[PDB]
Amino acid sequence: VQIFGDQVTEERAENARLSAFVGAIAVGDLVKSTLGPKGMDKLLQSASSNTCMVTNDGATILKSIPLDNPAAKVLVNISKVQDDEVGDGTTSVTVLSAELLREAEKLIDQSKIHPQTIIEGYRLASAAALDALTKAAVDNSHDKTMFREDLIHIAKTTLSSKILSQDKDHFAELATNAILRLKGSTNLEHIQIIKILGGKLSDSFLDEGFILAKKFGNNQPKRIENAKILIANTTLDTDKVKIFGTKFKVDSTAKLAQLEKAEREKMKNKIAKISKFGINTFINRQLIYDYPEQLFTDLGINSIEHADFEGVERLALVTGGEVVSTFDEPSKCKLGECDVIEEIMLGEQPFLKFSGCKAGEACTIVLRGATDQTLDEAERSLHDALSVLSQTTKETRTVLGGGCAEMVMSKAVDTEAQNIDGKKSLAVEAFARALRQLPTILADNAGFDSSELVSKLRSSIYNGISTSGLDLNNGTIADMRQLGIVESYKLKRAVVSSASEAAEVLLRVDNIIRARPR
Amino acid sequence: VQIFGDQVTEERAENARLSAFVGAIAVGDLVKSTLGPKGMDKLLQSASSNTCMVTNDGATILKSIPLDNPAAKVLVNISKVQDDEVGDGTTSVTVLSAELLREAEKLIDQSKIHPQTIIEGYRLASAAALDALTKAAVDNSHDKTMFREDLIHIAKTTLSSKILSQDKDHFAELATNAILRLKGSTNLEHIQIIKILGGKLSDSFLDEGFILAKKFGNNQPKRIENAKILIANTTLDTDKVKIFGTKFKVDSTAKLAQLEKAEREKMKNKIAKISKFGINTFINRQLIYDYPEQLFTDLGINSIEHADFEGVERLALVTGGEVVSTFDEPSKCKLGECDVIEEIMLGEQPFLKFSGCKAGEACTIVLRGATDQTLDEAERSLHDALSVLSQTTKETRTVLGGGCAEMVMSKAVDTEAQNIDGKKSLAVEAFARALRQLPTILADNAGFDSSELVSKLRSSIYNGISTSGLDLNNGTIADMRQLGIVESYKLKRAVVSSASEAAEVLLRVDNIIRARPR
Amino acid sequence: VPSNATFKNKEKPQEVRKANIIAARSVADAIRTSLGPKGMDKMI
Amino acid sequence: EMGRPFIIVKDQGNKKRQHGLEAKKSHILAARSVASIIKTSLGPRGLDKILISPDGEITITNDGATILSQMELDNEIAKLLVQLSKSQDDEIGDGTTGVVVLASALLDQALELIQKGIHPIKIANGFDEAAKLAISKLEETCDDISASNDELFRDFLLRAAKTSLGSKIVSKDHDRFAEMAVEAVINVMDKDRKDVDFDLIKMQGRVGGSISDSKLINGVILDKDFSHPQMPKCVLPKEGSDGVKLAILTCPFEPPKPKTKHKLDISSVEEYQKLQTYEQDKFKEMIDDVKKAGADVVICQWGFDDEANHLLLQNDLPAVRWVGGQELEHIAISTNGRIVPRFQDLSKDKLGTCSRIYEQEFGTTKDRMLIIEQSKETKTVTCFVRGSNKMIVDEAERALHDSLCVVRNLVKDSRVVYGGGAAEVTMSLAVSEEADKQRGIDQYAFRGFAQALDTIPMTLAENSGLDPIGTLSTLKSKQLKEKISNIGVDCLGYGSNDMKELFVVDPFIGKKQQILLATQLCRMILKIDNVIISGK
């Protein structure tokens, strides 16, 4: 009978299944063109405010596009968390998750195997794949020169698909030099992205020290040699006194004029407390009123106001000092030193450029381009590069790229496919064909024949060698160690683990219950 | 610049092939359950007057269901031609032509084969396919007893798919006798299928004579013997002369009494000429009025009225006489003979039974069933059974079925794929793998394995045994000559040619143009 | 020679790139008149 | 305005206008929208297109005229291209797709020249001088085939027959359709090999069977059975006789009545019995007239009577009813007979002659279709085409119609040229050579037509999947190296860019008609400045 209500779509075991698989096909065909170095970027047009967005990342493509399909929402969420974990490889999760379901659609229809039996093949196949992925890795970080070279290769492999593919030889130095300056600290908040219109893509230059978009006061000078930097999370504004609930009872206005004299004398004594250190600049988090601003003139102190919360830590780590608010004891809180405090102009906005600091634990990537859509792509491209290289510092193991990681994992899966009895061995081989489909797609986006290079790569690796890969520039098999293509071990581990869990969730479905929308 | 008018749906991209390919897959999957002996019947709900229809043939199903896809019309039209040409194998064309497009889908997407290469392989693959049937056929024309046994086994094969799978042992003798009755007349219109609801399904029979749907008019007897049959298509009732401009210039009504008497005198004179033959039964297609009906009583002649013109052809051939008009010359004219005539009752409607006729060039079949729906299914059955057996007389060559016909084609098709080295070999292999699916769905409908059971049939034929096939009652390989199932050469030639040419249609599309509905 | 090594599916990117080019050139035709000393002014 | 309603033409607010450069961009882009439909269809590696009429019926076609004919359009520029393809289809019947792609190629190259500021009349005059110059060159380079005997002249039709069948439906049996197409013209032809009548051969399709079942039969196709089917279906001739003695009649079997409305008054019983005698004697006299004439099979236009059918069965005389007058025009020419109006003028000299009459089923219950065959060469051939689908046999009709039209062009003397992209490139390099000394203001006009002709080879490069620039570079360098101009694009990959080895031939009259209709339409579209269109 009718059990749900009006305007409620229900499906049962032939409409429920084949609606998620066609949704997995629908979400996978979109991100098929974005995979690889020769991939085309997708343009997203918003429904409101005529906001356009040029982006190559599969997560950002799925963030903006609305998708009412429940099966596609699983692919939307797994690309979100994959961007949260590593930052790169979200497209490979969506492609590998869709092709695993594309293969499983045939095993359910053609071979007539239960869904639970397909998962049991994927559990053993995924275990054999990760064991081969663990053994195929190589140690690093024992020699800093090799660790420097591998980060350059990882930056080249990451930016090969983004808009920086042509200038990756120059941006690889910019990407890897900033990470080594972190001194092991894994955090992306210490890197600023300043948007500048004009120039070309290769005009991005490496900055010595730290640069930000702020300005001096009204009366401050242009240049001060060997300036001492201080950072105040203070209120140099109308301080009030903090026992909110203070009011001023006044019997006559004679003492009220002397009361206002005490307020000016209160802040004068506070600025006099600043001058005991003998600093040359003063950085405040919030706005500085004019009366503090005039007092820094005769004392020879620079003033910078309205600093962001991230900018405090980003500037303090480069300075080396600590944020001070009390200003009571001059013994502790040793401040840094900067040689050149002179500002420069890049475009129509002046920026305060620093140089010759104690430490460079925070950095700033200056970018140049034509359109803001390209700068947004430049931001997302290097954010994925810096995110992968930053996690490579903590996780040392890496694995060869260029499609060799997919085929070398499928070798152990195919080896373990023969000794497994029952119908799940076909599902173990279906997992192998899913790994083979990634380099099949890399040849399709490049416009070369896919069946020949996959057949040559597959026959070559079974001979005994395990260093061969796809060279899409020449269109043939080549040595990946010569070209210098390598990726992190946690990236491909997260992709295979996320794709295995992606197929597992959607394969354990039998009914769809879509309640009424609000 | 939108050159087209308003509401003009055009698809000039990959969605056009996807929309055309998914339409055939939907039509293909719709008929997968109707194939084989264990197939399930389907139910049709009409939109006008709630007139239901139960039918297993794909031609009646696809013609009844509405489908707006242009690809669906090709599957509808190829099934209509197969239903009109042979009368059997329509679902095989629908499922094979859809599977050829299904197998051709992955070549377009995965392997990226040109559409002109896929059809070019199907040309050479279809040529080798028909050549396999040239050598695999057997001519049983030299002996009538073996040909009599061949019509049994063909009736066993055709009737097993419908609801008469249990009663096919009894109707196989009924079907083959009707063909030996017609002695080569392949016209299916010479068999009257009288529909009777009620009674057991096995109560059908085949009387040696022609059974009328009507009875005697007023007083003519039921039981007679040694009756001479005379057939006329003559008005023979209130003769309106060939020119309608005739009139009577009547000067007095007494003379008009003579004119109406003269109309009775010529009619009395015409019936007097009927008595010169010395007959006891007279049959006319026009409905007989009262005045000529009365004159047959004194002469001792029986009268039957309102016979249909299609029944006069059957009536003349069972009786063996000739239709006589212009009765002045009884010498040149011919009349039939019969031993006994008797009126019977099967249910509520009475019928006239003829038995002991000289000529046996036609017959009538009386069916019995629980519902009009079962009776309809039954009817549609014997029509498909008698249609194949009727064409078996003119095409004596036969082919063994049960998965052996599709596999011996694939044995020759796979042999020719090696001598055409290049990219065309994948297309010919796709044509081979499409033929493997017909015994697969035949195994899936009975609830057996799709891979292992087909694999045993694969190995059995290449060992050098071209008589192995599937046996569905036990689920194992058995000999086809002992079981006794065989099809005609025209059937297997038709479905291979129809399914092959049907694949050529929807592989050359690259655009779908939809104008406005009217 | 023919029927080998590829087949160009998904020609909609080619159709989309043509639509973007003619869309950009059609906007450029309105801006083209304002070039040089003999150009004209635009009121919006 | 000055406040009053300023109206000039009726329905002022409904219709619009368009002028300036924006009117031109609407024209060229409208041609590119139609050219993209035709560009992926042209050549042997093309793809049909599927059309849907408003009545639900579909037609799977790949001939530019039938596509554009059943296409509901709004833009007038495409509607002129609809008529241009129909113009090529009616007269020549070859190159519809070409005329369309080629006219767009002239229009696409004209877009760049309009940007430079060339007046459209100088553009149109440039293509007119270039078109006649290319026709004047191609008329000199092509060779004549009339010097060869009839045995080799049959092979030239097989060269063009295989060219026309390919790129279309029934590619599977195209070797037999070429022989069947050539065999149709061997029967129907003039002794001087000139001005053959095309109306003698009509098209007839049958929904059923397979393509292999099609064969040649010299006769008429009637969609009806014999009257009162008790006789044997297949009637044979006598032992000694000239033939079956076919008889045709445009008079129904009835008593003779006036054509005007009449009133036959019978004022007596004696006159009423004479009417019965008059009724019977007319049918008796009628069957005796055709009996003495020796006819075996009788064809009646306006049908007949139950009473004569029996009289027809006893005398072993098959007959038919409801035969339309158009079919009787086809029966008299095939069997070489004269249609008698009445029985009084019946004579043995007017009766036709044919080999045999028979009928088959084609299946279960479809319909009984009559078949006639001749024992020798006659002036009538009826193609008996079968098909597994209604769209297959429908496309096979217009495909075979174009095949007979291509052979009809070769009946004209000294009109042969080797196609395959060779005719386009060989006419292109000479136009660029003339521009080097005929520079003037129209130097870029010749370069536009030179680049527009080369697009059809590039269209074949896209469908075949080869590199266009490498193809045109090799063909252009080969034409400059050697003056032999029968090398073209090797579409089917048999090696040999040369075209004599691959047995391909196009009509010369068809090829020059491509640039004529393309240039003549481009001269018209470039004249349009104001575009006034009204609302539906």
Ligand SMILES: Nc1ncnc2c1ncn2[C@@H]1O[C@H](COP(=O)(O)OP(=O)(O)O)[C@@H](O)[C@H]1O
């Ligand atoms: N220069 C290159 N040469 C060959 N293959 C490459 C190259 N750069 C990247 N790849 C391949 O592209 C695949 C996906 O790259 P990735 O950076 O993850 O793209 P996305 O970020 O869009 O997922 C990897 O598996 C890798 O093998």
Ligand SMILES: Nc1ncnc2c1ncn2[C@@H]1O[C@H](COP(=O)(O)OP(=O)(O)O)[C@@H](O)[C@H]1O
């Ligand atoms: N008892 C049986 N044993 C083995 N095979 C059978 C048996 N009954 C039917 N079949 C197979 O099933 C098929 C039924 O085909 P059918 O349903 O008649 O096709 P269509 O309905 O399209 O004419 C035949 O090819 C036959 O070989």
Ligand SMILES: Nc1ncnc2c1ncn2[C@@H]1O[C@H](COP(=O)(O)OP(=O)(O)O)[C@@H](O)[C@H]1O
């Ligand atoms: N078998 C073939 N080999 C080489 N070229 C061919 C072949 N068939 C057709 N062509 C070429 O394809 C071009 C387009 O022909 P097509 O578009 O099929 O004819 P139409 O325009 O009359 O429909 C012609 O110029 C012809 O030279």
Ligand SMILES: [Mg+2]
């Ligand atoms: Mg990446």
Ligand SMILES: [Mg+2]
């Ligand atoms: Mg059947």
Ligand SMILES: [Mg+2]
């Ligand atoms: Mg043509």
